[PDB]
Amino acid sequence: GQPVNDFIDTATRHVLMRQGVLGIKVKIMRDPAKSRTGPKALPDAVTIIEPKEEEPILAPSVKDY
Amino acid sequence: XXXXXXXXXXXXXXXXXXXXVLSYYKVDAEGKVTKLRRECSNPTCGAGVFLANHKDRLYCGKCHSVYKVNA
RNA sequence: ACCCACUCGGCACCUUACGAGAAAUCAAAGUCUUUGGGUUCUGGGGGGAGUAUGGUCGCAAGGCUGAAACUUAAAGGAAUUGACGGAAGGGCACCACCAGGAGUGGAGCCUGCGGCUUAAUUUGACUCAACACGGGGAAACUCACCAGGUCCAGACACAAUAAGGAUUGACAGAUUGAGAGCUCUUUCUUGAUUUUGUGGGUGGUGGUGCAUGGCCGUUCUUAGUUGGUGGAGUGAUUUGUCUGCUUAAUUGCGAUAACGAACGAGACCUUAACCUACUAAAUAGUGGUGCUAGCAUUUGCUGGUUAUCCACUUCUUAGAGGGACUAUCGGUUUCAAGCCGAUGGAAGUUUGAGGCAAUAACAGGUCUGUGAUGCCCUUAGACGUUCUGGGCCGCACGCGCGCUACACUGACGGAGCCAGCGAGUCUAACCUUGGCCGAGAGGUCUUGGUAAUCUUGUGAAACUCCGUCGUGCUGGGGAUAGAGCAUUGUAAUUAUUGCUCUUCAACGAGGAAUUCCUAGUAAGCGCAAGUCAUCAGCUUGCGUUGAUUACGUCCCUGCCCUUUGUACACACC
Ligand SMILES: [Mg+2]
Ligand SMILES: [Mg+2]
Ligand SMILES: [Mg+2]
Ligand SMILES: [Mg+2]
Ligand SMILES: [Mg+2]
Ligand SMILES: [Mg+2]
Ligand SMILES: [Mg+2]
Ligand SMILES: [Mg+2]
Ligand SMILES: [Mg+2]
Ligand SMILES: [Mg+2]
Ligand SMILES: [Mg+2]
Ligand SMILES: [Mg+2]
Ligand SMILES: [Mg+2]
Ligand SMILES: [Mg+2]
Ligand SMILES: [Mg+2]
Ligand SMILES: [Mg+2]
Ligand SMILES: [Mg+2]
Ligand SMILES: [Mg+2]
Ligand SMILES: [Mg+2]
Ligand SMILES: [Mg+2]
Ligand SMILES: [Mg+2]
Ligand SMILES: [Mg+2]
Ligand SMILES: [Mg+2]
Ligand SMILES: [Mg+2]
Ligand SMILES: [Mg+2]
Ligand SMILES: [Mg+2]
Ligand SMILES: [Mg+2]
Ligand SMILES: [Mg+2]
Ligand SMILES: [Mg+2]
Ligand SMILES: [Mg+2]
Ligand SMILES: [Mg+2]
Ligand SMILES: [Mg+2]
Ligand SMILES: [Mg+2]
Ligand SMILES: [Mg+2]
Ligand SMILES: [Mg+2]
Ligand SMILES: [Mg+2]
Ligand SMILES: [Mg+2]
Ligand SMILES: [Mg+2]
Ligand SMILES: [Mg+2]
Ligand SMILES: [Mg+2]
Ligand SMILES: [Mg+2]
Ligand SMILES: [Mg+2]
Ligand SMILES: [Mg+2]
Ligand SMILES: [Mg+2]
Ligand SMILES: [Mg+2]
Ligand SMILES: [Mg+2]
Ligand SMILES: [Mg+2]
Ligand SMILES: [Mg+2]
Ligand SMILES: [Mg+2]
Ligand SMILES: [Mg+2]
Ligand SMILES: [Mg+2]
Ligand SMILES: [Mg+2]
Ligand SMILES: [Mg+2]
Ligand SMILES: [Mg+2]
Ligand SMILES: [Mg+2]
Ligand SMILES: [Mg+2]
Ligand SMILES: [Mg+2]
Ligand SMILES: [Mg+2]
Ligand SMILES: [Zn+2]
User: Fold this and answer.
1) For ligand 2, a single-atom ion, which residues have Cβ within 5 Å?
2) DSSP string covering chain A
3) Nearest residue (CA) to C1' of C211
4) Which of A15, A29, A63, B44 is the most exposed place for a label (fewest CB within 10 A)?
């Protein structure tokens, strides 16, 4: 998919030797968190903000200013 | 593949012949020098270059061929 | 006779496993390096071989006893994971079938393949996954093939020749297809650039895709791959990754010695749909106004006018947003994931269609895309290259993709008259409107455009309407062939293509077979783009007209999955 275009660089290189040639194929996948100028995460990613304990009750009452 | 055939007769090349040449020019009894063979009135060939003597034919070789002066 | 409890001794099963084992497994195969209850028998790597020999028993066939030489690095056991089967159980799919549509298979031609022919008819590829494929529509070129002619563009090093010239070129004639000084005659020219030899290079559409890279196709219209902590196992391993249900999906639910995750699917991206909300526009358009034509006249109706001005953004353009999450409701389901129906909605089949796409495999195709490349071959009487000419088109015939037809839901003739995706000329001749001339093809003079500006509203074709014909190989059909005219091109003969007249074939719905397809789809219909000097019956996209039939299954076929067997693991070639 699309994240491929966004996050992985590839290169093929032909390395000519005494016997024949070999194909080097390099693939690098870069930290998307660091994206900088694009999307900062995979389309996959789904973060939930973590609530907060509450200490409720305290029967009514009102503040004045 | 197939290899070879030939109803024969291979073609050769050329030679530039021999000739200890430019004897042509003649100097009299000490020491006046007269040119044999006439030279070229083309601006390109400042009259050092001569004309070969055939028949009808006098011809400038320096002009790689160029021009047909006839006397 | 039957039931309950007990107990000796039987044939067995069940669950455990403290314990054993290399494991499979085992209440003995336990009580074994913490090694001793009694006793009997047999084995000491594989083959050679239960062979030779002697003894013995037998009527015999044979039985018992039973060697060595020599050969050899493994043979063997159990389990694991793969791979594979002409074993079994499940699934998925219009490259499967059901219900059907439109066909192909029959005909004419077009075009590839075989075959034959040939100087040559260059060549790759042969089930799906070779054959309108190599973007492969070849007149030269391309081009590799064939008949023949030039050239070196043979780096460099050493040696040799050699300034008394190493070498170079050529006018005319001869030659030659040729205005190739190819060679020859002849005799000027040139000046250390070459020549000759060896060494070494260099080019090659020469060989090897079974030496390679890269790319691509296929498996795959598939759903699979892995690691952390836990559990099992001495171990390779396994569980997680599973009976079921569910999904297009190892997509999920659920079950659960597993829990929680990552690659792949999904997400993501592109394009088609919806925004009287946002920002705008003489390279897009609308309303008002002026200038103005025509028809009515009573306002009116229908046009002209890239700026005569004013305002707008519904339509067009493209930025930014918004929108859908199978929403609401209800059926159904283990009331789970889901599935179904109704309403709403631009939109509810993964929204439609694509792009991307893991792990692994193949001796799939490509050395003929590459100045990617190993090795082999070849290298001046070239397999380098170029030039002239022919050839890839050759035709008893087999095969594939196609085009056009057999007519009356039609052909012909008037007339109506509507798309979308494209593309176009600088140091050049591309897209072409308009005016004339021409039956046509085309010609000619001008013209706008490097483009939302001009071609172009690309006035496309099927289609619609009024006529002619009237079922007759007919006015359906347009093969084959003759004559003439033009266009591209240096060149049109074997006829590039276009036009006119004439000639008027087979084909009366196509055997056995076989392809493709579920909605703006199928089928019909044209167009633009690729190729392109010229040539589309091909492709790639595009819009126009627009259905019948399923919404299911495992019968055929194909494939994945379990279970199972394996003496395979280079893995059933
Ligand atoms: Mg995806
Ligand atoms: Mg002289
Ligand atoms: Mg056990
Ligand atoms: Mg035990
Ligand atoms: Mg017991
Ligand atoms: Mg032994
Ligand atoms: Mg023996
Ligand atoms: Mg005996
Ligand atoms: Mg005996
Ligand atoms: Mg007897
Ligand atoms: Mg014995
Ligand atoms: Mg014996
Ligand atoms: Mg031995
Ligand atoms: Mg096994
Ligand atoms: Mg059927
Ligand atoms: Mg049929
Ligand atoms: Mg060839
Ligand atoms: Mg296939
Ligand atoms: Mg040629
Ligand atoms: Mg030459
Ligand atoms: Mg040499
Ligand atoms: Mg050599
Ligand atoms: Mg080559
Ligand atoms: Mg291969
Ligand atoms: Mg390869
Ligand atoms: Mg081959
Ligand atoms: Mg399908
Ligand atoms: Mg499994
Ligand atoms: Mg695993
Ligand atoms: Mg799938
Ligand atoms: Mg009025
Ligand atoms: Mg009025
Ligand atoms: Mg708008
Ligand atoms: Mg509705
Ligand atoms: Mg979409
Ligand atoms: Mg092969
Ligand atoms: Mg290649
Ligand atoms: Mg080669
Ligand atoms: Mg190429
Ligand atoms: Mg390359
Ligand atoms: Mg060659
Ligand atoms: Mg051909
Ligand atoms: Mg064939
Ligand atoms: Mg095909
Ligand atoms: Mg008509
Ligand atoms: Mg005329
Ligand atoms: Mg102009
Ligand atoms: Mg338009
Ligand atoms: Mg008839
Ligand atoms: Mg007709
Ligand atoms: Mg011709
Ligand atoms: Mg021919
Ligand atoms: Mg007729
Ligand atoms: Mg029919
Ligand atoms: Mg052509
Ligand atoms: Mg075209
Ligand atoms: Mg083609
Ligand atoms: Mg067995
Ligand atoms: Zn001269």
Assistant:
1) B 24
2) -HHHHHHEEEEEEEEE-SS-EEEEEEEEE--GGG-SSS-SS-TT--PPP----------------
3) A20
4) A63
